[PDB]
A = this chain, B = another copy of it.
């Protein structure tokens, strides 16, 4: 699991930073990538990476600002042009449906894959046996959402070499053992499946703020998360400091600041980082193509 920042700017594109988009790579976990926001030229940034449109499974939009969505039509179109056939779901605030459906309609685009669009509300926006994503209205009167991607604890992996070494060849019995069932082997031995499973893997979690302002809702949303990705500036100081205080109180493990305006160049960026670091040591001022690993434990 890794975060690959495709665009870390704000408002409008700059040679140094494209408008916002962060890729949550889950190749090992689901053979896919999930995108958080999708500003114009996001697919162009991807051309400089190993990420292809076909690998994108989901796209989550935090706010209906142009610098967060104008890259969607193009990305959806390229994925179709390239022959992607897997389903893709877009989650976003009200208006995302119209934006997408109207764009694809006027450009006479016929997708080669199933496309699901969900206009979200505070609560659980997606869940399966592996992950659960919750969305929260961060700022009191704002049509923006923060998201928490929570990887669920993973059942302990099977100690297959030990089984083979006990002369228990791969097959149906492996499934029962995996479930913790007691099994009767071909030679008559009785084996307790649980004795052959490693401890469960604790799920990791990444939180995406969606707005520069902070709140208690943000703090609780990010409680004990591995990485908190926050928008540091408005496209137009204490903001960063507050983000850092929030991460500290929420006990997040790492704070990454993105959505940095042109006003901050070169050293200015490092000063932004320093502001956060003074409160929360493990803080980062993201930059385009930065990649952050999210290890278990």
Contacts and interface: CB of A to CB of B under 8 A. Distances in A.
Given A66-B73, A81-B11, A99 B103 contact: yes
Interface of A: 11-15, 18, 40-41, 43-44, 47-48, 64-66, 69-71, 73-74, 77-78, 81-82, 95-96, 98-99, 102-103, 105-109, 142, 235
The secondary-structure label for the interface of chain A is loop
Nearest to A97: B106
A78 B108 contact: no
Contact of A142 (B74, B78, B108): B108
A268 B225 CA distance: 51
A280 to B, nearest CB: 31
A82 B11 CA distance: 10
Nearest to A65: B107
- Nearest 3 pairs between A and B by C-beta? A95-B106, A40-B74, A41-B41
B13 A44 contact: yes
Given A41-B41, A98-B106, 14 more contacts: A13-B47, A15-B48, A18-B44, A40-B40, A40-B43, A40-B44, A41-B44, A44-B44, A64-B108, A66-B103, A66-B107, A69-B107, A96-B106, A102-B103
Contacts of A98: 102, 106
Contact of A106 (B15, B44, B99): B99
Contacts of A66: 73-74, 77, 103, 107, 109
A65 to B, nearest CB: 6
A142 B99 CA distance: 21
A70 B81 contact: no
Contacts of A106: 64, 95-96, 98-99
10 contacts: A12-B77, A13-B78, A40-B70, A44-B44, A64-B108, A69-B107, A70-B74, A70-B77, A95-B105, A102-B103
A2 to B, nearest CB: 22
Given A40-B43, A99-B103, A12 B73 contact: no
B109 A40 contact: no
A47 B109 contact: no
B15 A71 contact: no
Contacts of A70: 40, 70, 73-74, 77, 103, 107
Contacts of A18: 44
A105 to B, nearest CB: 8
Contacts of A73: 40, 66, 70
A216 to B, nearest CB: 24
Given A40-B40, A102-B102, A78 B12 contact: yes
Most B-side CB within 10 Å, residue of A11, A69, A103: A103
A47 to B, nearest CB: 5
A152 to B, nearest CB: 33
A65 B106 CA distance: 8
